[PDB]
Amino acid sequence: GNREEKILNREIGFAIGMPVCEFDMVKDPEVQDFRRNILNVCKEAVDLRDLNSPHSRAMYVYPPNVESSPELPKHIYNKLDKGQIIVVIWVIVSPNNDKQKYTLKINHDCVPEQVIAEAIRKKTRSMLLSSEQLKLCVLEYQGKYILKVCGCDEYFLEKYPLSQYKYIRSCIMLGRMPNLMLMAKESLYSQLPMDCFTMPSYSRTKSLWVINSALRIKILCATYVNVNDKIYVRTGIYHGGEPLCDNVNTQRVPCSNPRWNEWLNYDIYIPDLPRAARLCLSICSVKKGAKEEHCPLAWGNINLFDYTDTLVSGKMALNLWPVPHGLEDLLNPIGVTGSNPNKETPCLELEFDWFSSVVKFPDMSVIEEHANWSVSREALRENDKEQLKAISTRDPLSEITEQEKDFLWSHRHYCVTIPEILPKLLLSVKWNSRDEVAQMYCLVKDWPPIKPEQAMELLDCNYPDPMVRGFAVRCLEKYLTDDKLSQYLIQLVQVLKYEQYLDNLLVRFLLKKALTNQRIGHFFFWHLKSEMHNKTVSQRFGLLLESYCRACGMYLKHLNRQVEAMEKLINLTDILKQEKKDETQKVQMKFLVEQMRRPDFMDALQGFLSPLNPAHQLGNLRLEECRIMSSAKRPLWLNWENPDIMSELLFQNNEIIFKNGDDLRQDMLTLQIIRIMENIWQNQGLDLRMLPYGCLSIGDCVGLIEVVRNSHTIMQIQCKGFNSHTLHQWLKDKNKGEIYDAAIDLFTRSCAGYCVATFILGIGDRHNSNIMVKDDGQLFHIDFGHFLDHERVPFVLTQDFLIVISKGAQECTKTREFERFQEMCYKAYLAIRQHANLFINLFSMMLGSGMPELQSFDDIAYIRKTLALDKTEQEALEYFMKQMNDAHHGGW
Amino acid sequence: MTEYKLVVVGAGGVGKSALTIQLIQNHFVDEYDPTIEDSYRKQVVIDGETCLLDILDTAGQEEYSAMRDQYMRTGEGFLCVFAINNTKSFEDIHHYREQIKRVKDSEDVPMVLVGNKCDLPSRTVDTKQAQDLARSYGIPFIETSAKTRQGVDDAFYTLVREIRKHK
Numbered sequence A: 001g002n003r004e005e006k007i008l009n010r011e012i013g014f015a016i017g018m019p020v021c022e023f024d025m026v027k028d029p030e031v032q033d034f035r036r037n038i039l040n041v042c043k044e045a046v047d048l049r050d051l052n053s054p055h056s057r058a059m060y061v062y063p064p065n066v067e068s069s070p071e072l073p074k075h076i077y078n079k080l081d082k083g084q085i086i087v088v089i090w091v092i093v094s095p096n097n098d099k100q101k102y103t104l105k106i107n108h109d110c111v112p113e114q115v116i117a118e119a120i121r122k123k124t125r126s127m128l129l130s131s132e133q134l135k136l137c138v139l140e141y142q143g144k145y146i147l148k149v150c151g152c153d154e155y156f157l158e159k160y161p162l163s164q165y166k167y168i169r170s171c172i173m174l175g176r177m178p179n180l181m182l183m184a185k186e187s188l189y190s191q192l193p194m195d196c197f198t199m200p201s202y203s204r205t206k207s208l209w210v211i212n213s214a215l216r217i218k219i220l221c222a223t224y225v226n227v228n229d230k231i232y233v234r235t236g237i238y239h240g241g242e243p244l245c246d247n248v249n250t251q252r253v254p255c256s257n258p259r260w261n262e263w264l265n266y267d268i269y270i271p272d273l274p275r276a277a278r279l280c281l282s283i284c285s286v287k288k289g290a291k292e293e294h295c296p297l298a299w300g301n302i303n304l305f306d307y308t309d310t311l312v313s314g315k316m317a318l319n320l321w322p323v324p325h326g327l328e329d330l331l332n333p334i335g336v337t338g339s340n341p342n343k344e345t346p347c348l349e350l351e352f353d354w355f356s357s358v359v360k361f362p363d364m365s366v367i368e369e370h371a372n373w374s375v376s377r378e379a380l381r382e383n384d385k386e387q388l389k390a391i392s393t394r395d396p397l398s399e400i401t402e403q404e405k406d407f408l409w410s411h412r413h414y415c416v417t418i419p420e421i422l423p424k425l426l427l428s429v430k431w432n433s434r435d436e437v438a439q440m441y442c443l444v445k446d447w448p449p450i451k452p453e454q455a456m457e458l459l460d461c462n463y464p465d466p467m468v469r470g471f472a473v474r475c476l477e478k479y480l481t482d483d484k485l486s487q488y489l490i491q492l493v494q495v496l497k498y499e500q501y502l503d504n505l506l507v508r509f510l511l512k513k514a515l516t517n518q519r520i521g522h523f524f525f526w527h528l529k530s531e532m533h534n535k536t537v538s539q540r541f542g543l544l545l546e547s548y549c550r551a552c553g554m555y556l557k558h559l560n561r562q563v564e565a566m567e568k569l570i571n572l573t574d575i576l577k578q579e580k581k582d583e584t585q586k587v588q589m590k591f592l593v594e595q596m597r598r599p600d601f602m603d604a605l606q607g608f609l610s611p612l613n614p615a616h617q618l619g620n621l622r623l624e625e626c627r628i629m630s631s632a633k634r635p636l637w638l639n640w641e642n643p644d645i646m647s648e649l650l651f652q653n654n655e656i657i658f659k660n661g662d663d664l665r666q667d668m669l670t671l672q673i674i675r676i677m678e679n680i681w682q683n684q685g686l687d688l689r690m691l692p693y694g695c696l697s698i699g700d701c702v703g704l705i706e707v708v709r710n711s712h713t714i715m716q717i718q719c720k721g722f723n724s725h726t727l728h729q730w731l732k733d734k735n736k737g738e739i740y741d742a743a744i745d746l747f748t749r750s751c752a753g754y755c756v757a758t759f760i761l762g763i764g765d766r767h768n769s770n771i772m773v774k775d776d777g778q779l780f781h782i783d784f785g786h787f788l789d790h791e792r793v794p795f796v797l798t799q800d801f802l803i804v805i806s807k808g809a810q811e812c813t814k815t816r817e818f819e820r821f822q823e824m825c826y827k828a829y830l831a832i833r834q835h836a837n838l839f840i841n842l843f844s845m846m847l848g849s850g851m852p853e854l855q856s857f858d859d860i861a862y863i864r865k866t867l868a869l870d871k872t873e874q875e876a877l878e879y880f881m882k883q884m885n886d887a888h889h890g891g892w
Numbered sequence B: 001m002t003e004y005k006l007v008v009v010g011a012g013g014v015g016k017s018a019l020t021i022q023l024i025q026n027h028f029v030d031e032y033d034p035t036i037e038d039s040y041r042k043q044v045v046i047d048g049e050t051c052l053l054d055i056l057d058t059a060g061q062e063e064y065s066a067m068r069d070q071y072m073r074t075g076e077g078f079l080c081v082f083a084i085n086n087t088k089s090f091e092d093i094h095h096y097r098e099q100i101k102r103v104k105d106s107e108d109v110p111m112v113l114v115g116n117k118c119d120l121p122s123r124t125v126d127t128k129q130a131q132d133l134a135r136s137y138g139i140p141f142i143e144t145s146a147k148t149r150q151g152v153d154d155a156f157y158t159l160v161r162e163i164r165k166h167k
C-alpha cells in the first residue's frame, strides 16, 4: 500500500522476471508463511550492515577478495625478494586526474594500513618540511586513505596480510607487479548508498505413534489423459531415494476410462514412518507379438507430512509433471514435491486415511523418552577400533556390506569419538524403524561438529532427515568461511531442491550470507535466476529471489541493469537465429550492427557490472570490435570499455563471449573442479598452473564465457607455417633468451595438470581445436562439453607436445625432462586421490540439477574407476600407467 | 597541451632524485632514501611553449636493473646523470647509453648528459673530459648542483628542446 513499496515491487518484478503480485495470489499457506517468517533473516542481515557504519556498509558492498589461509606455500615464498614484495602505489592529482606513482618494497606480512604508512613516510622525506612529521602526518593521515586495485572495484578494507589478498597472491605467483591506488576513505564513504529497508505490507490432536494401522492410499481416478493401450499408476513410499517398502501398483485399466477406486496397502506401520517419508507415484502404460513395454507418462511426489508436522489425510488431488529426459525407472523419487502449476496436465485424485483427530508427528520430548526405553531394554574392544576408522576413510559411493552396517550400528555409541563416520552410520540405519530413528536422533543431537567439506555430504539426496540436515547447517554456520562459501555456492544452491519445505534451515543460512556479502549475493542471485524457467523450482527460487531483492539494498538497481542487458542480448540472438541463421555471417553482421546502433539497445548494453565478475565495470560498447564468432550456435564476441580511472594499468577493454544455444552447466562444473584441483596441488608443493576461466549460466542454455587474451589454438599455431616441430619453434620465437627455459617449464607443468585432470574427469575427446597455448607457454583446454561415461584418455599427448616438453630432442620418449614430466603426473594423480572424497560429494550434490551427464550415481562412479578407490595406493599408480602406455602406445 | 616523457638514469648516489625534487618543490634533501621507480610531473613554459613534463625517476642501484628495459622503451628523452665525485658513475654511464641504443635501435635518440654534484668543492672528474664524450655522443652537456639549483632548470629545459629536434 505504501508509495515506495509499489515502486520496489515493480523493481523486484523486473529482476526476477515475474510480477510479485502472482505471489500474493498463491493460496498455499506454506508459501504465505514463508514470505512472512523469512523476513527476520533480512532484519538481522540489515542490522549487521549498520552495526559499524560506514565501515560495515563498505565491507558489505566491497568485501575483501581474500584467500583461505594467510600461510604461503614454500614455492610461493621463494619467489619473494628476501620475503618482500615490490608494489606500485598510484595516486590521482585532483585537477586533471593524471596519475603519479611510488614504488615500495615491503614485507608480505604488512597489512594495508602499514603499506599506507610506508607510503606516507616516503612522501614526508621528499618535502624538506620535517619538524616532527611522525607526530601528526604518520598518524593523522594514516587512517584517511585506503588501497584500491587499479583497473577494477576491489578495495583492501580489512586488516588482512597483503599477500593473503587474492590479487596480491596471484601477482606473486605470476611475477607481475601489483599496481594499487590510494584514495581517501571520505571519498568511498560518500559513494555508499542509503540503506532504506522497511518491512513489506504482507508482514502483518493425536500422536503418530498412537495409531495401530497399516499405511494404505486410495487411487480414485485420473483426468486429462492423452490418447496415444492400457494404463496404471505405480506408487512407492520413499525416504529420500531409498524405498521403505515394496512399490505397489494398481490393476491395469484401459486409457479410455481411467478409474481405479482401489486401495493400496504397503508393508509399513504408520508409527514407523520417518519424518521425511514421501509418496512417489507415476502414471505408466503398457504396449500382441512383442514384449510389453512399460513407459511412465507423468509423475508426481507428495510429502506425507506438511510443514506443520501434520500427517496428510482426506481426499487430495495433484497435477503431474511430464517425465524428465530419459528416466531409468517408472518412478522419480529424486524429483521435487508438489503439484504441477500447469493445470492442463494429468490430474490424479487421491484419498488418504482419516483418523478422528489431527495426526501430528511427535516432538523430541516424546522421541527422547522412546530412545531411553529402547536402549535400556537392550541391557570396549580395541581391535574393533581399527576397523571403525578403516570404514570412515571409505569413499561415499563405496559398497558397505550388510555385515558392516550391522557392525556400525552396534558401536553407534562409540562412533562419537570418530565424528566423520556419521555419514556411514546414518546409511546403516533402518529408517522404517522408529526404534532406531529415535536412538539416532539422540546421537545427532549431541554429535560433534565436522569439517565443512564433510558436512556437505549430509546435504545431498542420501540424507533427507531434517535432524541430519540441521546438524550439517550448524557445521556450516560455524566453520564455513565466506571464501569457501563462494567456492561451493553452486553445490549449496542445488541441494536446496532436496529440502522438502520452503522454510528450512539451509535457506536461512544462504539468504543471510547473501545479504551480508554482496559478492556472495551477486552469484546467489544469478544461480537462482538461471533456473526460473524451470517450472519445478520457479516457485521456490522465485520466493527466495523476492526476499533477497527486498533486502539487498541499492544493489537491486545494479542487478536490474544486468538483467535488462542480458534480455537485450537474448532477444537479439534469438531473432538472429530465428531469421538469419542460414544467411551468411557477412549479412548476419550487417543485421547485428543495425540492431545494436538502436538507441534503446545502445544505452541498455552500456554502464553496468559484469555478471562474470561484479568488480568489472563495463562502459561503452565498442561496436568496431564486436563480432559474431565462427562457431555453431552464433556466439557473440562482445568488447566493452573499462571505465576505471586507471583502466590501462590492468586492461583497457573487457572481452566477454555471449553464447545462446549451448548448455553451460557442465562447463561450470568442470571449471569449478579444475580450480579446486589447482588449489589442492598448490597447497602441497605442486606448482601446476591451470586456467579455470570464467563461466556463468544466466538462463536456459544462455550464459557468458571469459575471454583469455594472448591465447591461440594449436591448430592456429600449426597453420602459421601438420609438422610436429612447428609448435616448438613458435614458443622459441616468442620466448628468446633466458626466458626460454621458463616457457618450457610453464608448458610441461600446465600440460601435466590438464593431462591428469582430463583423465580423472573423463572430459570430451580433446583435438587440435580444444587445446590452447598462451604466449608464456601456459597450456589449457576449452569446451568441456561432456564428462564421465558415454577408461578413455582424452588428452593423448602427441609427439608435438612431447618435443617441446623435452626441449626438442631427437627421441622425445627418452629424455631426462620427460622423466620429470611423468613424475609430476604421478604426484598430481595421487594428490587428487587423497581428496577424492570431496570430488565425489560435489557430483552427488549436482544430481538434483537437471544435467544430462549426471543422472544416477552410476555416472558418478566413473571417477572411482579413474582414481582406483577399490585398490591400494600402489596399485592405483600402476593403473595410471594405462595412460602413459596403452593410450600413448609406449611409456612407463 | 604537449607532454614530454623524460627519464633520469645514472648510478647509485649520483643525486638524480635530488635534481627532480629541486625542480618541483625546490626542496633539497640530504637523507639518502634509495629510489626504486617514482614518477613526477609539473607543467612549465619553455621557449614560449607551455608543455607538460612527465619525469620518471629510476634506480641507481644494480639491484633493480631488470626494470631498465621498460622505462627505456616508453621514454622520449633521457637525462644521463653522473656523480663528479664517483668516477665509476662516469664509467658505467657508457653502459646506460649503449643499452638505450639497443632497445631503441636508433643511434640518435633524445638524450643529454648531466654532471651533478658540481657544488661539491672537491672535483674528481675533469670539467673538459665530459665535452669530448658529449661530442662523441653528439649531445649537450650541463653541470648541475641539486643543492644550489644551479643549472638544474637549464639541464631539464635543454632535454625538452632536444626532443623537439629529434623529429
Ligand SMILES: CC(C)(C)OC(=O)NCCOCCOc1ccccc1-c1nnc(Nc2ccc(CC(N)=O)cc2F)c2ccsc12
Binding pocket: A089, A090, A091, A092, A093, A100, A101, A102, A116, A119, A120, A123, A124, A137, A141, A145, A182, B024, B039, B040, B041, B042
Ligand atoms: C602525507 C600527505 C598526505 C600530507 O601527503 C600528500 O598530501 N600527498 C600529496 C597529495 O596526494 C594525495 C595523497 O597522497 C598520498 C597519501 C598518503 C601517502 C602518500 C601519498 C602520496 N603523495 N604523493 C605522491 N606523489 C607525488 C609526488 C610529487 C608531487 C608534487 C608534484 N607537483 O609533482 C605530487 C605527488 F602526488 C604519491 C605517489 C604514490 S603515493 C603518493
Ligand SMILES: Nc1nc2c(ncn2[C@@H]2O[C@H](COP(=O)(O)OP(=O)(O)NP(=O)(O)O)[C@@H](O)[C@H]2O)c(=O)[nH]1
Binding pocket: B010, B011, B012, B013, B014, B015, B016, B017, B018, B019, B029, B030, B031, B032, B033, B034, B035, B036, B058, B059, B060, B061, B116, B117, B118, B119, B120, B144, B145, B146, B147, B148
Ligand atoms: N653535495 C651534494 N649532494 C648532493 C647533490 N645531489 C644529491 N646529493 C646527495 O646525494 C645523496 C643521494 O641523492 P639521491 O638524489 O637520493 O641520489 P639517486 O641518484 O637518486 N640514488 P638512487 O637512484 O640509488 O635512489 C644524498 O645524500 C643527497 O643529499 C648535489 O648536488 N650536491
Ligand SMILES: [Mg+2]
Binding pocket: A651, A653, A654, A655, A707
Ligand atoms: Mg578480459
Ligand SMILES: [Mg+2]
Binding pocket: B016, B017, B018, B033, B034, B035, B057, B058, B059, B060
Ligand atoms: Mg633516487
